[PDB]
Amino acid sequence: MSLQNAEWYWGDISREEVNEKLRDTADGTFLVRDASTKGDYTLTLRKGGNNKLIKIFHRDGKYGFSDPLTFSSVVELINHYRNESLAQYNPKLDVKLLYPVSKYQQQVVKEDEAVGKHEYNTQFQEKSREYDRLYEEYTRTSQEIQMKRTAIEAFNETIKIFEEQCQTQERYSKEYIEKFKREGNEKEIQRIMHNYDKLKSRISEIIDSRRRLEEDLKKQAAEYREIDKRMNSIKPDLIQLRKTRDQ
Amino acid sequence: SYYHHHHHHDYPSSGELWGIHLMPPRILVECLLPNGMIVTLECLREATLITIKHELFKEARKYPLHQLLQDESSYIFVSVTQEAEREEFFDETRRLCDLRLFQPFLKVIEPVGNREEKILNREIGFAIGMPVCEFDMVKDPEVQDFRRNILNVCKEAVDLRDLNSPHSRAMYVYPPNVESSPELPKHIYNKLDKGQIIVVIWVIVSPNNDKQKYTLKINHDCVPEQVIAEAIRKKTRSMLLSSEQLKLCVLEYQGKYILKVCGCDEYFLEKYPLSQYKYIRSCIMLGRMPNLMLMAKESLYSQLPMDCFTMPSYSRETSTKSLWVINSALRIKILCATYVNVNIRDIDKIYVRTGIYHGGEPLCDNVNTQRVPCSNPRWNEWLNYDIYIPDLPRAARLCLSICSVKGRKPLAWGNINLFDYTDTLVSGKMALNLWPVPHGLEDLLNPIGVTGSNPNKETPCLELEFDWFSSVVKFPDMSVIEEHANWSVSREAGFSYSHAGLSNRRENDKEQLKAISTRDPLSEITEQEKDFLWSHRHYCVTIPEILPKLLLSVKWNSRDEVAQMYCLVKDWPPIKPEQAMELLDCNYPDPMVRGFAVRCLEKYLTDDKLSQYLIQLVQVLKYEQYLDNLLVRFLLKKALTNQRIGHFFFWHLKSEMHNKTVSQRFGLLLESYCRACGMYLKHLNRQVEAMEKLINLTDILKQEKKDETQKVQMKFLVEQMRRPDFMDALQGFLSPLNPAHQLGNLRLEECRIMSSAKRPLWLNWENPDIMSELLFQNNEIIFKNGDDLRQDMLTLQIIRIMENIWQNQGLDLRMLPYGCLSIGDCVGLIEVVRNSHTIMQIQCKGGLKGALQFNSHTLHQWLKDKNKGEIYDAAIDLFTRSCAGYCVATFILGIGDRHNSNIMVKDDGQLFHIDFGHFLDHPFVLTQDFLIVISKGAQECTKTREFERFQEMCYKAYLAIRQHANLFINLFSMMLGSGMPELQSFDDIAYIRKTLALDKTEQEALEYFMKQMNDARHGGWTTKMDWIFHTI
């Protein structure tokens, strides 16, 4: 008893394991852990959005943070600063040890695969398999989309170039259509107008080719926002298993 | 590398037209003539533009208005490329299928902007993989300033290249490939055992390409000048001649000749001792005779075309308050978002979360009210931060998101620099386009992500209002911060005692407690230690290597402390480049800190080591706040000083161009590099063409309904490679794996699609060097398209570094860190190691009996053959040595799921270790086969003397890497920036922190490792049954 089974004594756990337990947690959240070189113990206190590692020094059967080691049981030390402010150890730490982590949350597990089990561990795999599926389809679509966007830009430049070609052949035809009607020379005017009607028709073809791409793009854009919508539905449920599942 | 590591014991996707991978053998192309008419011409897909034009103007004479046409040569083609630009094609030698056309059409114009040259440097566009001129109208002044201000660096580099015209230009193009230290480790020196070496020197004689040689025996520490001098003395012996004439001859012709390695483009252009050249040292290692080619300087110098660097087209007092006069607390107004993508299944609501950050964060971050129907994202509220504005550190930034977690009883993110590249504190209305959340992340904020608005405007878009004070607010100058530091240092001694941890300056001798410089970069520091360190900051200037720890002790949200830190940093003793690199990762955003780091590098990094850690230094460019900084200046300058450095600088930057969070920064950088690199751009363009054809080729084979039987895919491959456009593109260019290797003509018969799952390309080039095959090699590379090759790359780098540490401690363990280069989004090249086979391939061969009968002794039997008696001892030693190396590196790095197809052996006994993929978990092998090769004896080989020596190499090697943990921690740390799944956060690096003991003693570590190893378990699969599926 005493230290070994206090709510806030986790001992076993590592540096990473604490950081997950103190994520976005209010100021005053704490746990005690075994030191990585076994004083023997480490306090991890939340202040200002950070996780403060404070050593507990064990010299001659007495505990504390610095050389006037007043306390003598660790539980005596930690409980002191549950009621008293930490400001009497370094003024900048005006906070109190307000919130334990508690190694009682929701079954003695982790001691003895599917054997030591099983229901919504398997549900995770399914939601995690689907999250994979969607995120893949999601990034493919995203890049698909980008390709179309640069294709639309390519069409715009293409059309612009073909538009210029009419503005080119009306500059050159206009002063030849009126030069050939001097010679009473038609049918030659017919060949000149044949090219005009190929070029004009070609512009409609390209313009339509783009428009077709445009209504495919906004359709994909709609499809993309949908993938995202479905993904943001699975994120805050995939984590709510991890919470129920592991601990 | 040189010899195939063979010891001599006896001594947005691409592709040809839009929507189509491969354009048909014949196609119709529309030609828009300048007289206004459109004529369709039937073209072969490999038709050059010269002949297409020739055809166009032939057939135009049949269409109306033919007389308004000028001569054939008065015009140039213009079209739209699938990158959406109007390209003018000046190189009419280019084939139709090579122009990256969007549509099969050309336009005929008269060359306007008549600066054929500036426009022609469209070669930059191609190398970069982006049209230069997308830059030309970006608008962001930071960008446009970067383009202008970085040209200085180009000018200096280009000048520092003509400082001594012919020689310094040679040095740039062919830099000495040399080790960092002249001093020669015992075991390597002892391979000479007189302190001298036998070298063969080759000369190509009068046009007959006849090859005389000269064998010289020379002191290993001779400069190239003196080897040449000894070559003169030899030749001159035969002619008799008087001494004095003999003496005058050497004296006046030494510096008239040049040494080249036979069979690759490496030169000995500098006065380093011979054995400091990586090739000579490697020769000693391999038990090879150095083959060098003797050559007149004039013949090298005459064939270095260079000169042209031109300054490009882009070469053209207000109200200012000081930041620390602003008397208010920091607040930021959150207006509204355009939209976020959630249905409303359950209105877990939307809120903007914000934080003020230094990578680690200067304050408690806050959310706005969950004021949301998701229908309308609107808050319109000022958020109040508990940090005084004057306390804001220079690299302060705001990191925000819109998200969700859930209450018992994500979404989109973005980062903003609170200061400009001009030191202006941001004020006024500001719109920010948000970024999609990274795959393996759910942290509400992502402060390690990039800074600035998402380029893609079709995204959620947050609107913010920053405070406006009477005028422009600026960060104070150093020449004012300094004054404030000195003032507050003067206040310290006037205090009475103080009862607060960040206390003092006598200084006691208990400060042996500052042997925590010895502790690794992720050892982490108690608050007591943070306060202890800061109290003694002045005694630290005597233990320079604590700087990173002290820096993590500083309160960055305190102007008083930060000012003092700048003072200390300003005249801090220099630290070894290894330690300086730590200071360029994400934990050290402050520009003063990084400036110090870059200054160490400018002073103590050899070009050798820069090459070794380039991968990391490129990555670290992403953590820089601003485009223009001292690290880009440093790297870019070295890249433009040393073409070997420059080459990989190019490919490391190019390989990430697809990544939009980095495109602009890297493209900009690449642009300045390409503009100033000189003639190598031409060689780079050849490499990019080659790679693009390969990418396009293996795309067809990978999707475009090509999943038929291997034989079918081989028919297609053989047809495509014979086509002239492919022949031209994939022959006669430098190897991106090592630019010193010329890749000549393909050997088509040797080129294959491998019949693995991944079916990569195996390509084979001739070596076009005069002294090649008969003295060096032919050239094999795997083209991998589909698998991310960055992990392999990193692993192979670490292996090379590991080998370095051991080899320089006189611990002779041989690794095989073969070439591997990622060149794009899951595209890469892998060096082929010749004369090697997988354990499996060996086991399957006869085993001097037949069929597929093996057993545990087969490996040893195979090596005993191949190294028939007397050379044998070497083979066993090489195997034992290399095996040890990989046994330890594998364990340290957590490279698991090894097996007999993962591990290869060479004819000479060397072992390695291919196809890495997975990293730190995300173990310990020793198969019985290997146990039997070490030793020779039967089932008893876990208690042989050979096994004990083997275990000793393992202990000694483990401890060596352990002693250099710090390098490795920092190397992995710098690599956190990229998109490696196995390296998303510091907690991933923790793995090697455990594998090497680190939080234990050397004595506890050795014991921990011993334990890991004396377990190990051994055995192996052997005909008996199920060596295929592994049943029992």
Ligand SMILES: COC[C@H]1OC(=O)c2coc3c2[C@@]1(C)C1=C(C3=O)[C@@H]2CCC(=O)[C@@]2(C)C[C@H]1OC(C)=O
């Ligand atoms: C297990 O898949 C081996 C093999 O096939 C692959 O798809 C693959 C996945 O990365 C690699 C490979 C290959 C291509 C494999 C290389 C390698 O590392 C080796 C690296 C060193 C070397 O010589 C290579 C090229 C041989 C080669 O295998 C042979 C020929 O057995």
